[PDB]
Amino acid sequence: QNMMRQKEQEHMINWVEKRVVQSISAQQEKETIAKCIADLKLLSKKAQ
Amino acid sequence: DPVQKLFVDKIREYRTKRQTSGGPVDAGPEYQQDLDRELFKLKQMYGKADMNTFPNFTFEDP
Amino acid sequence: SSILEERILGADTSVDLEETGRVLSIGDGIARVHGLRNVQAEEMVEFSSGLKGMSLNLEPDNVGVVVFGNDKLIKEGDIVKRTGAIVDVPVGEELLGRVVDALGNAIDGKGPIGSKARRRVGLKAPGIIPRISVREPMQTGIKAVDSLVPIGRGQRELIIGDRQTGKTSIAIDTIINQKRFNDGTDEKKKLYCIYVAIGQKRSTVAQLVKRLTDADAMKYTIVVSATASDAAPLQYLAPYSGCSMGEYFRDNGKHALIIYDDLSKQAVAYRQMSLLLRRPPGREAYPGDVFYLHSRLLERAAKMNDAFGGGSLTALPVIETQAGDVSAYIPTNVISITDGQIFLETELFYKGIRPAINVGLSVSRVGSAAQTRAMKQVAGTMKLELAQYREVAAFALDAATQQLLSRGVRLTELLKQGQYSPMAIEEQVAVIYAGVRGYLDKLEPSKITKFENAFLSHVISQHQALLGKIRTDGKISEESDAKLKEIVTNFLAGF
Amino acid sequence: YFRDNGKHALIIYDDLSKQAVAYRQMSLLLRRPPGREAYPGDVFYLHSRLLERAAKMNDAFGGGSLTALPVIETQAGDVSAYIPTNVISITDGQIFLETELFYKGIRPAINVGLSVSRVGSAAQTRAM
Amino acid sequence: KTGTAEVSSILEERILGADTSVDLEETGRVLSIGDGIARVHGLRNVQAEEMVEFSSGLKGMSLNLEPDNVGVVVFGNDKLIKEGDIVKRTGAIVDVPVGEELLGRVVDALGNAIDGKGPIGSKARRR
Amino acid sequence: FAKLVRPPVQIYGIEGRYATALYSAASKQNKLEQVEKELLRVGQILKEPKMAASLLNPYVKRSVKVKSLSDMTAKEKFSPLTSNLINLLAENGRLTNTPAVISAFSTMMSVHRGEVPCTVTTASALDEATLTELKTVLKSFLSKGQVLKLEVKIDPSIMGGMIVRIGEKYVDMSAKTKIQKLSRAMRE
Amino acid sequence: TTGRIVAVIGAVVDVQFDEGLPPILNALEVQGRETRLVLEVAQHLGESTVRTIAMDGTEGLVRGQKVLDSGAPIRIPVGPETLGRIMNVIGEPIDERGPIKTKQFAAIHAEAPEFVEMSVEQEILVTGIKVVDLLAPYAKGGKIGLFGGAGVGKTVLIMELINNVAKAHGGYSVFAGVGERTREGNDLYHEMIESGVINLKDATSKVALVYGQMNEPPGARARVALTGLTVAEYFRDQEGQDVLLFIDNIFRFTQAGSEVSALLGRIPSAVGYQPTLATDMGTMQERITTTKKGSITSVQAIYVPADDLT
Amino acid sequence: TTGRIVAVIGAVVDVQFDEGLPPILNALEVQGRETRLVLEVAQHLGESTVRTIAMDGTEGLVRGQKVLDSGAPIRIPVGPETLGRIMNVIGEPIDERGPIKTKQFAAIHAEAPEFVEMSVEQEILVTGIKVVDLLAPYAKGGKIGLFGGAGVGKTVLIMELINNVAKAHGGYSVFAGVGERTREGNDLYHEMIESGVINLKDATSKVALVYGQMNEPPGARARVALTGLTVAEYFRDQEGQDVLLFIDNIFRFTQAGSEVSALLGRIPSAVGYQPTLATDMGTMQERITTTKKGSITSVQAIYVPADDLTDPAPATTFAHLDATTVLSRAIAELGIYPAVDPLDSTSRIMDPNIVGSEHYDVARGVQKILQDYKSLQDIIAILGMDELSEEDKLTVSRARKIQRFLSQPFQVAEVFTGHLGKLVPLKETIKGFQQILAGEYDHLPEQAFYMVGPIEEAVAKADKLAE
Ligand SMILES: Nc1ncnc2c1ncn2[C@@H]1O[C@H](COP(=O)(O)OP(=O)(O)OP(=O)(O)O)[C@@H](O)[C@H]1O
Ligand SMILES: Nc1ncnc2c1ncn2[C@@H]1O[C@H](COP(=O)(O)OP(=O)(O)O)[C@@H](O)[C@H]1O
Numbered sequence A: 001q002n003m004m005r006q007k008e009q010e011h012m013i014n015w016v017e018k019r020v021v022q023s024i025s026a027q028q029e030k031e032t033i034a035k036c037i038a039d040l041k042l043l044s045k046k047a048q
Numbered sequence B: 001d002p003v004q005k006l007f008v009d010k011i012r013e014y015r016t017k018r019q020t021s022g023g024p025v026d027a028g029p030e031y032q033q034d035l036d037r038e039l040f041k042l043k044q045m046y047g048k049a050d051m052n053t054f055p056n057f058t059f060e061d062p
Numbered sequence C: 001s002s003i004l005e006e007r008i009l010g011a012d013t014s015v016d017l018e019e020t021g022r023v024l025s026i027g028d029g030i031a032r033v034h035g036l037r038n039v040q041a042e043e044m045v046e047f048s049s050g051l052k053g054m055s056l057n058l059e060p061d062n063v064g065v066v067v068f069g070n071d072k073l074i075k076e077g078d079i080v081k082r083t084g085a086i087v088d089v090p091v092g093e094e095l096l097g098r099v100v101d102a103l104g105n106a107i108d109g110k111g112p113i114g115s116k117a118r119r120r121v122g123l124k125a126p127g128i129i130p131r132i133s134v135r136e137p138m139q140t141g142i143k144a145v146d147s148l149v150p151i152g153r154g155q156r157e158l159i160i161g162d163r164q165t166g167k168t169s170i171a172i173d174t175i176i177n178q179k180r181f182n183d184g185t186d187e188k189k190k191l192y193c194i195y196v197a198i199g200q201k202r203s204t205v206a207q208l209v210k211r212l213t214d215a216d217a218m219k220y221t222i223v224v225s226a227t228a229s230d231a232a233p234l235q236y237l238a239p240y241s242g243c244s245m246g247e248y249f250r251d252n253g254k255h256a257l258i259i260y261d262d263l264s265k266q267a268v269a270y271r272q273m274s275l276l277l278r279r280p281p282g283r284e285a286y287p288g289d290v291f292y293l294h295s296r297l298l299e300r301a302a303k304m305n306d307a308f309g310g311g312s313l314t315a316l317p318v319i320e321t322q323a324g325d326v327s328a329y330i331p332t333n334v335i336s337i338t339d340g341q342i343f344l345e346t347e348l349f350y351k352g353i354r355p356a357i358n359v360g361l362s363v364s365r366v367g368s369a370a371q372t373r374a375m376k377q378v379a380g381t382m383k384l385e386l387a388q389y390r391e392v393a394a395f396a397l398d399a400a401t402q403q404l405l406s407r408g409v410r411l412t413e414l415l416k417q418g419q420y421s422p423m424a425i426e427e428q429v430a431v432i433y434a435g436v437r438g439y440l441d442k443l444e445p446s447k448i449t450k451f452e453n454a455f456l457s458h459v460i461s462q463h464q465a466l467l468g469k470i471r472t473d474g475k476i477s478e479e480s481d482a483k484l485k486e487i488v489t490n491f492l493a494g495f
Numbered sequence D: 001y002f003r004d005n006g007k008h009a010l011i012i013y014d015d016l017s018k019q020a021v022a023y024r025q026m027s028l029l030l031r032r033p034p035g036r037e038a039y040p041g042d043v044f045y046l047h048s049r050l051l052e053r054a055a056k057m058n059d060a061f062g063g064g065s066l067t068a069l070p071v072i073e074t075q076a077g078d079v080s081a082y083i084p085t086n087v088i089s090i091t092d093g094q095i096f097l098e099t100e101l102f103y104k105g106i107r108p109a110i111n112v113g114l115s116v117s118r119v120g121s122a123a124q125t126r127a128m
Numbered sequence E: 001k002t003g004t005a006e007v008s009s010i011l012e013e014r015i016l017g018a019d020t021s022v023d024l025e026e027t028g029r030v031l032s033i034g035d036g037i038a039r040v041h042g043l044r045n046v047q048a049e050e051m052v053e054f055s056s057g058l059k060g061m062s063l064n065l066e067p068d069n070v071g072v073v074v075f076g077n078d079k080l081i082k083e084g085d086i087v088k089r090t091g092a093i094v095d096v097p098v099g100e101e102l103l104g105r106v107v108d109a110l111g112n113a114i115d116g117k118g119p120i121g122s123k124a125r126r127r
Numbered sequence F: 001f002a003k004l005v006r007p008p009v010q011i012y013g014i015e016g017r018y019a020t021a022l023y024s025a026a027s028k029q030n031k032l033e034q035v036e037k038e039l040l041r042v043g044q045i046l047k048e049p050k051m052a053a054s055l056l057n058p059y060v061k062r063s064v065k066v067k068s069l070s071d072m073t074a075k076e077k078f079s080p081l082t083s084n085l086i087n088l089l090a091e092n093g094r095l096t097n098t099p100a101v102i103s104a105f106s107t108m109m110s111v112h113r114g115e116v117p118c119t120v121t122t123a124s125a126l127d128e129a130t131l132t133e134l135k136t137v138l139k140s141f142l143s144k145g146q147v148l149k150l151e152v153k154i155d156p157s158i159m160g161g162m163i164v165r166i167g168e169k170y171v172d173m174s175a176k177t178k179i180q181k182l183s184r185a186m187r188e
Numbered sequence G: 001t002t003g004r005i006v007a008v009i010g011a012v013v014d015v016q017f018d019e020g021l022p023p024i025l026n027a028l029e030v031q032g033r034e035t036r037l038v039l040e041v042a043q044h045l046g047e048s049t050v051r052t053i054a055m056d057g058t059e060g061l062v063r064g065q066k067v068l069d070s071g072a073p074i075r076i077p078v079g080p081e082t083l084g085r086i087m088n089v090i091g092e093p094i095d096e097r098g099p100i101k102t103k104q105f106a107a108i109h110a111e112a113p114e115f116v117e118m119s120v121e122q123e124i125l126v127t128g129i130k131v132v133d134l135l136a137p138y139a140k141g142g143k144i145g146l147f148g149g150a151g152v153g154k155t156v157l158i159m160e161l162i163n164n165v166a167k168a169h170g171g172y173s174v175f176a177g178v179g180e181r182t183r184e185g186n187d188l189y190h191e192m193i194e195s196g197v198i199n200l201k202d203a204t205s206k207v208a209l210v211y212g213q214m215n216e217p218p219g220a221r222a223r224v225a226l227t228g229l230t231v232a233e234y235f236r237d238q239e240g241q242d243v244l245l246f247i248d249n250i251f252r253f254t255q256a257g258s259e260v261s262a263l264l265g266r267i268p269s270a271v272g273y274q275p276t277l278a279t280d281m282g283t284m285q286e287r288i289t290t291t292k293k294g295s296i297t298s299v300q301a302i303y304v305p306a307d308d309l310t
Numbered sequence H: 001t002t003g004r005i006v007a008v009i010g011a012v013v014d015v016q017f018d019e020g021l022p023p024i025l026n027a028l029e030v031q032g033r034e035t036r037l038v039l040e041v042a043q044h045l046g047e048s049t050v051r052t053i054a055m056d057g058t059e060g061l062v063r064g065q066k067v068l069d070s071g072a073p074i075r076i077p078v079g080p081e082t083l084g085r086i087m088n089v090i091g092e093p094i095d096e097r098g099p100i101k102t103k104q105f106a107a108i109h110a111e112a113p114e115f116v117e118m119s120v121e122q123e124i125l126v127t128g129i130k131v132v133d134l135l136a137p138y139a140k141g142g143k144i145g146l147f148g149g150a151g152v153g154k155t156v157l158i159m160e161l162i163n164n165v166a167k168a169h170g171g172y173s174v175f176a177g178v179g180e181r182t183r184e185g186n187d188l189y190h191e192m193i194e195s196g197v198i199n200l201k202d203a204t205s206k207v208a209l210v211y212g213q214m215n216e217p218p219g220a221r222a223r224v225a226l227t228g229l230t231v232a233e234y235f236r237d238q239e240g241q242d243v244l245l246f247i248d249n250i251f252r253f254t255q256a257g258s259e260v261s262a263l264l265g266r267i268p269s270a271v272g273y274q275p276t277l278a279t280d281m282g283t284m285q286e287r288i289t290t291t292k293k294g295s296i297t298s299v300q301a302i303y304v305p306a307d308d309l310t311d312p313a314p315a316t317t318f319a320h321l322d323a324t325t326v327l328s329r330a331i332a333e334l335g336i337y338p339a340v341d342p343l344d345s346t347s348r349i350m351d352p353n354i355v356g357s358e359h360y361d362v363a364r365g366v367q368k369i370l371q372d373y374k375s376l377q378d379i380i381a382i383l384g385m386d387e388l389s390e391e392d393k394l395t396v397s398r399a400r401k402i403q404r405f406l407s408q409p410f411q412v413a414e415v416f417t418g419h420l421g422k423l424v425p426l427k428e429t430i431k432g433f434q435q436i437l438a439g440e441y442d443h444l445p446e447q448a449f450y451m452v453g454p455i456e457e458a459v460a461k462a463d464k465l466a467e
């Protein structure tokens, strides 16, 4: 049971990283930049 | 909590994994051979008994 | 499965504004980092590859950073982020029973370490006021060590001997024997052992952990393994990590025992580090610093007074001497830092006399203090008798001389012991009593071992009341002496 | 040249310790890291890649051969020095020549206890 | 190959054309004192093994004549010399007094009485 | 010795040590801007193929180097500070690393007037509206007197987000780092 | 990416990349050699320069030659087709018998099996030799010194151990001849062919020979032990079986490491040995262990310098 | 002034000042610390930069902190208010009883007494130790050295000297424990408290204590010796009283100086030691002198690394001591204690005009016979004693008797041995050795002399053994 669980786990994570590296091309760049810019604003606010 | 794109991305991809898991997905023969060898070493360490046979020793006396 | 998805959630992904530097040159295990303007000395920086390094040199134009891993995972141009804290390690009771590496990263599986407190590996030893004389006994469970060269709580004994003479075995028996105390009621006798493995084969430590788990001895032991393969800056650091995990107990009113094994393989890692830093080699190529390295480490094995919690941290450094040269450089560096020593001869060992303590040279400079009174009564006589036997064993006439030879041989046969077989204090008292008062001078020496075994079986079986009386009242009263005398005589009768 | 043409040669270096000294001078003047006894790190490579050219080609390559008899001087019969041990671990034997035997009549003073030939009697005529 | 006298405090003097104001022939300035050895910038006319005199009465003996600085050795404790002190020549190879006046005196390595009986009244000096 | 005025940013090595000498020389007399001008002019002069090839040959008497440099600095009527600096470099033999010197000075001058440098690395270009709002936010990090000196950059190794460097401070919002952090945290 | 040899000092070559450096221990191929010269990276000097140690003679290297970064440490073929084939450090076959055809490639710079993978019960490899198995039993995944020089039966004993282990356990064997005399290497090869452990016809050889000759620069004699460990590690992990690993000699391994460290310019340790002697020995010896998949039992011929065991 | 840290390597901190530098040997305070970290200047690198040795842990020093010049070297409180206190190198109290409230401070880097101040009177100091009294009589007012490997008796011997000499003393005393066990320092503190030598509620204390124990960085170990010298120099001069100054272990002074001399950028001397070993030792040991204003009796315990007496450190220190006492591991392995080597111990008052003629003659006869036995040992170790003339057998018997008789049981070693500690007056020692040499005891066995006081006890033990 334990061996099967762990092995399936690693295989699952490999498949999932394949999926994420594939989907990274998906067009979300603009909202990503917007949110990170807001985060920069928060960081600067804490900097002072 | 959903704003972070990566979290939702991993969430949805794992969801897809779960639904596709109606049967285990993407075994690949390598999977089978690895199973073979690891089960072989496991049983060899344990023994050649059945999967679920409740045995007995049939005791004796000096 | 979905447990893994939960594992995804709750992971800290918030970004932070953090100072950074750029690696200039990595090679020989020392990286040269450019930048890091506000980096403290002895700080712990983190490379882009997940490694860690200690900021050793703050030169005007760069920072020398000693890498705590394999320097093959560090390029030139990498990014180094200062973590803003002097080199720290996790401490607490969450580590007990865990095999953490030199930095507290569990190499055990069994999930992560749930520690909530951190100490500095580079702390300072307690001064002169906090310390108090050594009072309590540290029971090693080994007849020779517990009787002749006793140890106290707060003392820092040394175990010194050649290859394969039973140093690790003495350490492991000391660790195992603490099981009885760590189950009783009073927290004042519980000892939380630690075991630092420095430059040792990884398989050896694996089997050692398996043995400690068989004997149920991992409920309190922490193994801090910086094995042979691990980079030198990890073997150099492991003793300090362990000593911090022990200082935590010492400073929280508890009692700890730390076994560095070996300290001759930390000084070699430090010699590597220095020579690769180009520092001027000294005697045997060791840097002149090689003393401060051990002095600062072993000066923490203190014994705080009651106004400071009352804890304690015993230390048992293990040194290994080539060809049994006790007068080499590192052996003398450490013989002048510690409070005693246990010399393990390699020719006594080859005679089957195990453990091979060379009682002629072994000594404990707290000695009679912090020894159970009963053991004192029984073993002072043995110390004198062994002294007399040694004085004359150079030739093998009269009645007294032959008596000394015979009694000494009997006692030598009596002090042998088996692996992973620690003996309660009362059992040692009983055996050495039957040996010294003279209830064995007729039995052949070759049988003295067998006798011992059988005798224990009887004593532990019938007269547990007497042994409990000795243990509770840590002294052999006259009535207890008489009962023990008749027990020994009766048992010996059946021979 | 004679080895690779079906002929048999015998080269005698005399000594190989002085080649090592000359190489050491060259290196120390080129400022290369000294090493033991100030010998650079290549005083093994230097001699090994020289003595490994004494071969015995098989018939497909001509059948020629090339023996070598490097001569080494040892200071005070010290054969644990750097170069003597470097060249003792490269060769197929050694012929010790002790002076104590030289002066008590035994000339050639070939100490036959320490002398060896890892080739052995495989290279002796059936009569000998 | 960084010259000793290639500090900034010297290159600045050179850059802004002010070196001509100071004497760099019979005088120098201590670049770096440490462990009993001074490096001195200047003294372009100091002889090898000549004695020099620091600005605190301490004497020294210019041993090293390197292209850009002078390695001087202090005949005393350098606790009193500081970076920038003025070292001025003495003109003569290190020499010691001699004569029959020294007879019966516990003189010092340099010819200074340390018995407290008064100065040595010597007449001649020898290198 | 004199009390050379410490430059704002400290540089090290022979390059930064000559540069500190020159900065302290010019700061007294308050000739920083013109000195920088003559430095960035010798920057062009020394690149001349004839001079570039002549000054790298070690087989021409160093006095020849000094004479040629005195000629080429008298022709351009350089301030006395720059002529003295170039003569000093020729005397000492460091003119082979002049571009490191003058470059250092440029840096040592930027930090004087507050051109706190920055750097942004992305997987693709940036729309001028986005870049301008980015500049506006980054300006908030600085102090009074300082002025941002942005430098855009592009790399494909980082997939998403970007990486920002503000002098010493450094924030990595790349998708690469986030992916790695998630993978490690979940695995461990 | 291609760099340019900037310096060539003896066996130490300094290469200068321009785009991105190769991590330490990578293998670089010099372009322009009739043979194949491989440089192993050793330091990152800065200014995009890397100092490297050559695996072959560096005669004829011009200052500017193009050097192609392979992209991973020295990689060798580790199939079951190595058996009976001699190969050198960089993986080429030195028996002029045709290329070693394998579907697997292994990088010779690995790391010791983690703590969890370690086996905890101490078994006893049964060599089938009475004296060895009674008085000094061998342990699975253990190191075994072998004293005694020539004329005593060292080669015959090695062959017997190879045969018995291949016969009574089904496990193959590797022979890493570090610092191997060419004459002795050829004699060993022919003795094995005669004795059947190597077979040139029926593809049932029980030995994989790796030879780091005595005339190769130190950078090569210090890595052949790792080539042997790579082949044997394949036989242990990817084929789950016990393995024998003979290392003749083990002193020449430490000596080669010492020369490499001296060449790089590191302060010699106690008696002229490299400062990294302990960890140089550890990284190698710590991959010879009995993990949960199999075991490597190493028989290491040992030479004691000056009859000095200290 | 006010400089800023520019480099921090180990215990060596390079600092930069923009105004005037501090002169060498000054002390500087690192502003912005949770404790007091004093940096003592040592070099003037140039560029208004100085290189300093830190007298405390330099962990947490950021390149660019602020360092504030003190203007004077390290100055410690001196006076009669330091008696019974404990002090670290920088003179802070470390006994937790409040500040050392003195009127007057002393700089730890004073100069040695001038040649026109040295005293010359020589007088024997009786210690109650047989071998020390007989062969290497200590001189009252002169330096004394205990040369020992590791684990041979240096500290038990210096504690026996403390007891014997000090407790029977009138003047003050200073114990400067440099680079030695911390628990030993604590045990000494709590052992003098119970002896009334240190008083925690009065002003009748006689002993000052200074400690630089082995947990301290190299910077502190290299200077605590100077703090002890200062605390003792004061009592010598500003009181005109006899002082006793025990130092243990003085070798740590030079060892620490070498640990922090590779970083100062010096070329290492013979065995890695600093190039300035001899001069650094001289400038320190030349202040420990009896002069015309006072009289310091110094007892210094010198470690001998790896049991090498030709090591540069002990080899150099041999020239600064009046009386040496070479404890040897070879003797200690025989069980003789104190392990003093009779043929390496020396004194400058072994003169027939100083210790008389009977004392000198007995001491020289003992040494002659021990030397003869040592010469015989080479043959004895192979051809046994059955191959010696009769006079040689008799000499060997006497030599073994004398070797044993030199051994003594100390008071401080009761816990080890259990035997009662003995003080043997000088006359009893001379008498006993004279008798053993004459031959009055050729009938007793060797063991009758092992670990006994005056020869009366030897005769008594022989009688006990005879029954
Ligand atoms: N008390 C004992 N009785 C019998 N055998 C013992 C005893 N102690 C140790 N041994 C034996 O000695 C062997 C090696 O001992 P051990 O490993 O403890 O020595 P060591 O000094 O730790 O060796 P190393 O330090 O090289 O690891 C073991 O196989 C063990 O069986
Ligand atoms: N078991 C054995 N039976 C017969 N002869 C043996 C045996 N073992 C060793 N020998 C002999 O000892 C000699 C030793 O040679 P060998 O071991 O092959 O080379 P090396 O001496 O280099 O190890 C062999 O020629 C062989 O004849």
Ligand SMILES: Nc1ncnc2c1ncn2[C@@H]1O[C@H](COP(=O)(O)OP(=O)(O)O)[C@@H](O)[C@H]1O
Residues within 6 Å of the ligand: C336, C363, C365, H148, H149, H150, H151, H152, H153, H154, H155, H156, H157, H337, H338, H408, H409, H410, H413, H416, H417
């Ligand atoms: N006079 C003595 N009598 C008996 N034993 C002694 C004597 N002197 C020293 N020893 C033994 O030798 C050991 C040496 O310890 P010590 O002298 O305190 O440290 P050091 O190594 O500095 O000399 C002591 O622990 C003690 O057991």
Ligand SMILES: [Mg+2]
Residues within 6 Å of the ligand: C167, C168, C169
């Ligand atoms: Mg062990």
Ligand SMILES: [Mg+2]
Residues within 6 Å of the ligand: H154, H155, H180
């Ligand atoms: Mg001591």
